[PDB]
Target: serine/threonine kinase 6
Amino acid sequence: WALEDFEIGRPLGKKFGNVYLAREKQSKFILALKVLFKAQLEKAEHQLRREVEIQSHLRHPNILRLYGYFHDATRVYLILEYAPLGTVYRELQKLSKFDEQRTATYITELANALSYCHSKRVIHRDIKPENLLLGSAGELKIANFGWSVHTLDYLPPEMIEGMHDEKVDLWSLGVLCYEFLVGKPPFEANTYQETYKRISRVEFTFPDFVTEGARDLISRLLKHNPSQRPMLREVLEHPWITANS
Ligand SMILES: Nc1ncnc2c1ncn2[C@@H]1O[C@H](COP(=O)(O)OP(=O)(O)OP(=O)(O)O)[C@@H](O)[C@H]1O
Model:
């Protein structure tokens, strides 16, 4: 592949990452081209190989496809799937808060994607609104596996205790579900030392509108001990989820 093999379009967003809307000059295939600068990649490397390898190989309608990649003298290019509706982060800022049906639905799609990921021993470890995209029909799509392996408010007590490998994505899930329905992370604070303390002792409360069913699921996902969090299968079969998704 060569940069010459694509027509460049308008910019879709942006670190060293300038992501642009592009179209393969051969079949007009619309996709997103992420550009990464080597100087800025070295300056701060393999953290990127980590991605490419992982994501290239994944394949779930709810996981952003990495069709391939290539390099130049100073420019590395990741050829990704194009997500028409932008990020869930922006959507949440626009709606301020999601209803139970949208939330349940996003959680369902996200658990199906993670289930798929975990069945392949791949853990995202960086699930948050900014890393979730929406496809042409509003289908949630997990992206940026740069932290994946084989955000402060969304990190589990096991990543702040002193980093682990398997029920950290369930914690992030329970956090995300809360932020979806309430409009703000459950441990949000003005300070680092307090969001750290609040997460360390799992100190959070629910407004008064968050329903019982949601409270139940979130409470189960935000357990201090990993083993005590539910399996993705339990999430999918939770009453609140099946009744609202
Ligand atoms: N596949 C995609 N579909 C839609 N637009 C996207 C896609 N990837 C990136 N964009 C947009 O471009 C922005 C920048 O992309 P991205 O966050 O990956 O850049 P970055 O600074 O390189 O981040 P990271 O450190 O995770 O690699 C995103 O926040 C998003 O709005």
User: Anything to note?
Assistant: The first helix runs from residue 38 to 43. The pocket of adenosine-5'-triphosphate is lined by residues 12-15, 17, 19, 32, 34, 64, 80-83, 86-87, 133, 144, 146 (CB under 6 Å). The two ends are 41 Å apart (CA to CA).
